[PDB]
Amino acid sequence: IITHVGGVGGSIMAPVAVSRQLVGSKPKFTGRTSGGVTVTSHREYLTQVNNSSGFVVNGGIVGNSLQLNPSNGTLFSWLPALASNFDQYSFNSVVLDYVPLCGTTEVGRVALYFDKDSQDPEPADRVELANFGVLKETAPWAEAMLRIPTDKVKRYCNDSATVDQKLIDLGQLGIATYGGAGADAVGELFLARSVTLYFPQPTNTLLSSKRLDLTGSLADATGPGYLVLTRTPTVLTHTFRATGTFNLSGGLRCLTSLTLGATGAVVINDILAIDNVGTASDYFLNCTVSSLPATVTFTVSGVAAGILLVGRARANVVNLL
Amino acid sequence: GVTVTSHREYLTQVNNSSGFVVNGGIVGNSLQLNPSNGTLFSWLPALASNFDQYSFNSVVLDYVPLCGTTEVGRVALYFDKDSQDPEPADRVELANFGVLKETAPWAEAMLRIPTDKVKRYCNDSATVDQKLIDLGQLGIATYGGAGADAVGELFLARSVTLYFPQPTNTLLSSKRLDLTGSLADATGPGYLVLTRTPTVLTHTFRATGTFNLSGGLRCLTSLTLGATGAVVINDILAIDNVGTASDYFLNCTVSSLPATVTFTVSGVAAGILLVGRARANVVNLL
Amino acid sequence: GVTVTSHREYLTQVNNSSGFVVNGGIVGNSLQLNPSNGTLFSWLPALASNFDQYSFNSVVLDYVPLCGTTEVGRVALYFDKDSQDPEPADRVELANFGVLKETAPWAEAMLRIPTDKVKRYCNDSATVDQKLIDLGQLGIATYGGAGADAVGELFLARSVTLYFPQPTNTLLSSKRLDLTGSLADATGPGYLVLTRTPTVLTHTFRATGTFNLSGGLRCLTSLTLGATGAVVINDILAIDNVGTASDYFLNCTVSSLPATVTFTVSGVAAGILLVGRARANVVNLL
Amino acid sequence: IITHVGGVGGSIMAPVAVSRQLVGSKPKFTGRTSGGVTVTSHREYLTQVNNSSGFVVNGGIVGNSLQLNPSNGTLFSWLPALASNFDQYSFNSVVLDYVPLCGTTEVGRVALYFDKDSQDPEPADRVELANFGVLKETAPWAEAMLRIPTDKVKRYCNDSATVDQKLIDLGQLGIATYGGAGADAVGELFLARSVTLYFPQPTNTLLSSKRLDLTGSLADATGPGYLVLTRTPTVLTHTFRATGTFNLSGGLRCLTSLTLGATGAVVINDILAIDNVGTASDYFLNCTVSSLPATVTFTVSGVAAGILLVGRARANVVNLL
Ligand SMILES: [Ca+2]
Ligand SMILES: [Ca+2]
Ligand SMILES: [Ca+2]
Ligand SMILES: [Ca+2]
Ligand SMILES: [Ca+2]
Ligand SMILES: [Ca+2]
Ligand SMILES: [Ca+2]
């Protein structure tokens, strides 16, 4: 069949393009009849690796997100709400898969790694990425793999909250691109799953609570974490980590009518915007992200207390009549 | 790619008290047995800084003695499993520890340490429950002396299993003082704290050996180089510009606590330095 | 009381040159396998620095791909048992070597390195017969390309046996320029050469990554910070005093050859610096 | 596996690129226990075929170099110094190998041939190259071969010298490129070796001696031949055929201080340059070629006698102190 030319048995072919074909990953639960507790193995997708001539990591996004715990609503788009009737998690297999949309003529580097410290900070440069134990180094166009070192320790989910994210999380996951020529798309990576659900509980809420200090930095958290809400002395920051349709509820301290800006992949849905000028205010809004960078920001003055809540929601109303 | 280390690192020179002193008659569980402890392990420092899980197999306290059969005191090495509990108050407390030893100063002593094989994490990301990650605490305690002179120099018998490797940590230290402030960033380890007082700096050692110092600061006012305690100055270079800020490189070599140094200056309105252990290495023009 | 090590370290980025080139067309058997070679081994940097003998078990060269199926060239990895013989002049010398591999640039390539079990010494005291101490030489060679762009990223398949425990071995580099002169001391390793020209400095990289730079010099004349090639400046701080000498701390991050930097100044009458690999770490006031 | 598209069994694939992978050729000697004389079979590389829109042959280089005798220091970079303890040569296999650095989109012709007359002159054009008995005709990007007709005649090496280069040499070797678009590189050719060493002698020196007549053309030779040293009425020519680090020794008749020029791949090493103006002069120099065209020339006047010697050498000194 195939006739390929200029080839004598034992020779190399670098083709114009390559592609694998990906299908319906329909999960299987297994009954580990135990404490009458469950086990799940399904395939959840994870992000579209775009290029970075320069040197970027999960989107140039920072605050080890990525985090291998399930939920990571940030990471795992389906497991979201099962390990949600449960309290202890434990994997058996997790494998990074890297397919490629681009073609044998893009010019760059992608790279998947694994840090056992859910908390150490991120890759600085070339020489650092490469020193990791569990790493892989691929041109972008060519097809790649990574399998992850799983213990069987009895590890806890984030339902109550826990600052030592390391003693509870399994690992960190990296994806890193340098040496590109443009920050376009070349890769879409997947997630090979297998998890052991344990002491199943009243089901935890997935709702987000995020306080800015009055002049300050940061008050409480509950998370998960889709959002960070910073202030700058005038003006807020609502910096997305998550994608989809959300629902936003809250307001803040200002005095000064709200001007609703945002930036990147964004589909505003319902912006409602009470103020009282002199005092504080409220915002409900409903938006829908499908990118990074998605940003939004409220524009205001004298941002002297920041409060919000975020808890994923449909094309759902959020405005008066 | 899992490395095993069994070495013998030096640790501190114990001075007496009449009174009742611990790990320097200093405080905040200094000695924590984790490697790094830049404070405790002067050698293991930048090996396990390429790794993420640590686990010992042997650790033994060794106590030799420089003094003579006529000093009058107590040395005492112990072991708290809670990297975090606070320190020895008095006589009756020190003695109640499981893994303790009670020796005169002149006489020669030992202690071996109870090691589990739990998969414990090193301090690259930070972790307030220093107990769930640290192996143990280490004590050394002296009461009943007659003078706070030196009688003992203690060592560290090592055996460690390094695991998942990625990125040496930072054998190199970065330490920012706010302009008027307190404290900017850190990278550490931490050998040094660099405080200011409104005039004048503080470089307060936690570490021992030959270092290398690089930096300068905001002042206006020529640098007068003082320091205090065990200290062997090596190279002090000292650019200023009076009116503005300045720079200091220097190379010194500590073998004590208390080692202090301080720069003397005025209007200390920004503090920056870096410290990353170094030899008898130059640090001055020609 | 000995160590063993098996990890994987990155090495340099193979660019292209239709000409015929060898390690960047730098010369003086740089790639030598010995560990340290700070130029070659970015990670083991600091284990074989606590040791005195070394011995490899595996060494494998790994060649992945930055370019694309239409890049147009030749790459080539080899191995000389004489840490000292000179480099490849042309195509025909390279091809005659025992341990060679010859690949497109675009396609992914391999090489295994031949290991003895001889008790070989590391470079702490110095040794002009670099051959009887070093295991082999490493080549990477590119000819017949069409542009001097990047095609390859080369790695290091490692497995090393450390023996008798040392007392550290500086990993902060010390590099003195004579007043009018050429060259004062060294400590090295060597990532950098610091030359002067009558006006102006040269900081010529041999190494890749995040460094930390500390020092200043003799001039009189405010500092203008240039550099050339793969370079990501991080923190440039720059005291001067005009009339006199000056200081520079800076933090940069190279991933190429050619990386250059140079300070621009006048009356370069003494050159001093130190360099000791460092993170994204601060190096400036506040 | 491979899925290649638009193909029904029996169809043709002309790929984006092809490459073979070449390794360490580590020679074997065989003991033909004879007159206690030796046999060698190893793989020596030979040149990088660059393109020639126009019509070029071993570099547009002329004076059948190329010559199949071993040594040919010009041709065989290793066999250089064994058939050097010997006096009779005889092959059994010699095969031209043509791999390719370029890609399936360069646009040209390469071509390997074989003339039984070590001495006939070179290919003029298209119609001439093709008429040879032992020739091969390849696009450049595609992968090629040629095997060579070996007799077993008892043929002599060039240790004493011999003007009928034909009665001693096995063959001529050609490589020819026409129809390009640029004189860049597409090919690197190799040499499949197998030689029978005979009456082994005191080992001959490899040193070159090259006399220009006073007004003339040409005095003696010893060779091998790496160099030709011509004059033009003013000025010399040192025209390389060889690559590497050499050592040059000599001077000449002029009167007129030496200006050292040269052209192409060249790394000058040590130029020393006595003159006496009025009279003659001397030059030692040490240079290092890795190309064709390498040229050098000395610039001078009244070039009334040319003498030199050349005998391959290291980064070795060649100047006073
Ligand atoms: Ca829980
Ligand atoms: Ca880590
Ligand atoms: Ca860590
Ligand atoms: Ca050699
Ligand atoms: Ca040594
Ligand atoms: Ca030693
Ligand atoms: Ca003969």
UniProtKB/Swiss-Prot annotation, chains A, D:
It is found in: Virion. Residues 199-321 are annotated as: P domain, projecting. Residues 36-198 are annotated as: S domain, virion shell. One of its GO terms (molecular function) is RNA binding. The N-terminus is blocked. GO terms for cellular component: T=3 icosahedral viral capsid. Capsid protein self-assembles to form an icosahedral capsid with a T=3 symmetry, about 32-35 nm in diameter, and consisting of 180 capsid proteins. Homomultimer. This is Capsid protein.
